[PDB]
Design a protein around this ligand. Sequence first.
Ligand SMILES: Nc1ncnc2c1ncn2[C@@H]1O[C@H](COP(=O)(O)OP(=O)(O)OC[C@H]2O[C@H](O)[C@H](O)[C@@H]2O)[C@@H](O)[C@H]1O
Lengths: 72, 363
Amino acid sequence: SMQIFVKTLGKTITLEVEPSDTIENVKAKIQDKEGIPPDQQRLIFAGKQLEDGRTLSDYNIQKESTLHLVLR
Amino acid sequence: AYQLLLSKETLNKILQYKQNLEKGLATPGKFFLEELSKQEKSISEMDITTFTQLLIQSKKPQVFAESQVYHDGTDWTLEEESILGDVSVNMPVTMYNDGGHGSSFKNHPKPISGYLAYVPGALLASGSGPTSDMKEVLDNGKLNQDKLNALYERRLLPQLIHFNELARQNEKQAAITIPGIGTGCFSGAYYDVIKPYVRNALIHILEKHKDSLPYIDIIHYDPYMGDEPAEKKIGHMSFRVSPSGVVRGTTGQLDYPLGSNPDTHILVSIVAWAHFSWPGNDYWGGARQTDDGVKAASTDTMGQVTGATGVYDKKWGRYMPPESFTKDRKGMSDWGDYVRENGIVFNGPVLALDKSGKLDTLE
Ligand SMILES: Nc1ncnc2c1ncn2[C@@H]1O[C@H](COP(=O)(O)OP(=O)(O)OC[C@H]2O[C@H](O)[C@H](O)[C@@H]2O)[C@@H](O)[C@H]1O
């Protein structure tokens, strides 16, 4: 259990996450906290978009990492 | 390897755009101007096909049009956007898995052969100003069903005509799988109401043009969620609403729907494409994500576009770049790195639907 940062274009969301959480899981936590549907969430880490079905661990996202949310 | 198609109305828009440039009423956007800047010929010296191909060539492998496009000429103009959103592209594909998103995909024991038709949905989201599609189909902020019908009719009919004739040439019928085009990222503020609008648009196109599509047989519409399971006879055609997020055990997008098989049908899947992107979009940046990226990754789309022979990876459900590319590399090896390194451009033959409902050259 750890925390990461999701920056918007801005209002930084702090999330409580596990290395094993899938990206969809993370996107769902963003929805709970911001009301943005997962279908309209694009998440970027280290310059690459994060895909459904992989975990934060898979991308080597560790404690206090910053993610970037792209929104309309 | 791939074939670009557009409506007669879009061909008119392109001819008017060229004339508008030649008469000094408009200036090209940065990315069109960039492709134009590589040319020896001026615009007035080009024919309509070259001109069209260079506008299409201004697409990038990966673009997020709902958020990072400004519609003000610093990337593309609205006049270019109105054209580019109408451009579709088809190609034969090997389908290596069923198209399930994330970790849900199922590999085909033996990959199946079929076709993809990339079609951009209504762009109803923006980071900056209103889009062309917002101006076209919204009346004072409200969705107009008849206008949305007309938009999808403009964009989809050339592909339905193309595969009606190709099913004939193959002495089969067509089975077509369709996702909830435009109901995800492109829906913007209309996310909560858009689902029945898209279903209704698909029904209107099929009903209006049923007599032009005698070789289209089965339509498998899978909005994933937000719609109810249903089956409807449309002329001779069987139109099924089959949301795989609400009904379990339904056929995937890259798989024969019930009642079709390789002997009786050609299999075609529509891809929810994107105005400014190459076919596949997200997957050029290595993300097997969205209808566009999943379907590209789960086929040899990238091989048809680049001309390169990739390798399917069963573990991650993914057509990977060629080994002759990835082997030596210590980093940056996804398909978009392949295109940067090899100067690949997105430029192919173009046909337009004509007055008589036939696909033909632009002149
Ligand atoms: N887990 C899932 N599994 C299967 N289908 C899903 C899932 N989640 C959503 N869908 C359905 O997938 C369908 C399509 O969702 P989208 O791909 O956003 O459609 P668009 O046209 O609005 O977005 C196009 C942009 O996104 C790409 O980058 C393109 O390049 C464009 O830039 C929806 O019905 C969802 O219900």
